[PDB]
Beta-2-microglobulin, T-cell surface glycoprotein CD1e, membrane-associated (Homo sapiens), 372 residues
Amino acid sequence: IQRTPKIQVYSRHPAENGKSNFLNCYVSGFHPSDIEVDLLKNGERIEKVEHSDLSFSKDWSFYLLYYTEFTPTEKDEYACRVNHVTLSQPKIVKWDRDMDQLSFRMLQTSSFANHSWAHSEGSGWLGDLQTHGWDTVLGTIRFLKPWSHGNFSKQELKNLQSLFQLYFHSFIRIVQASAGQFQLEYPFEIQILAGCRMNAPQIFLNMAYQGSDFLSFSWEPSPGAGIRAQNICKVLNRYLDIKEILQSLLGHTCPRFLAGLMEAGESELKRKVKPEAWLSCGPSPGPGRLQLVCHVSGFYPKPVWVMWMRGEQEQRGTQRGDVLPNADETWYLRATLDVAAGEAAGLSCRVKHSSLGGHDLIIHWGGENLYF
Ligand SMILES: *[C@@H]1O[C@H](CO[C@H]2O[C@@H](C)[C@@H](O)[C@@H](O)[C@@H]2O)[C@@H](O)[C@H](O)[C@H]1NC(C)=O
């Protein structure tokens, strides 16, 4: 299945229209991962445009964060331009002042453009935070956070490195072979999400193909997959050695390891960061109609609760848009409530979060203005 991407554009702080900042384009909900993105100054691609390693969500769709530093002027258009097969012309979204899990996850994506070429990325998260990555060239574990070692010995991991290195190297080789037997259509990608967690059961490992639950761990085919999975599971159910290997790795090794990542994290896990919030007038929807927007940002951990107010009286029109990430492993949420200019004054916006601890940030309105 193919899924047209969802460009979302937002800054990290507000513009005072003068002071240096980051811009975020965040692209998600898209398959296949062969994408091109760019950021724009008035028509112009920039350069020191950083982005995170690729990844994918519980529905196999992919997602990314593209960002750069820069300062704003009262002139100066900004926008996020994205091209991707399912699109019929680069859908460029414009920026605006006025807007517009205690489990160790190892995720892999191996893409297969043709017999000649292939490529794979792989990652190693813990809950929301990516703990590890893979060096494809040098064939080795990029550790990422410092405590990403856990209490696994220097030598302990040195081995796993290899046990993956073979794995990764085998995987491409084998599939490329199997390809025709099982009528895998080039180009195609195969995703995998394996790991530890809980506390009943413990293990897991799912393996989509063209963005679709295809195969899972004995080995079971997915109904939707059809005969292909059905077949592909046979070949695999028969290799007991393989079953057993993983059974040991994900069974009791990786959870021992999880235990490890968990206890070694703490100081950065039990970590709290105060938000920051401000105020818009997103586009007036129709006649004498306002649309004040909230802008909580820069907070961690994720769970945040946010309401447009008016004293203690919760305003139930508050719409709560998605939680994007900023680059500094923090969050950003934009809550929005729209009502007639007369209903407008007196409105607050209240931001509950663990980092404040009892003292919810309250943010009132004098348009297009904002305290405290
Ligand atoms: C096999 O595909 C190869 C990879 O093509 C990729 O290159 C990217 C930069 C992108 O633009 C897409 O074209 C692909 O994801 C390529 O090196 C070979 O020419 C292809 N071989 C044949 C025989 O068609």
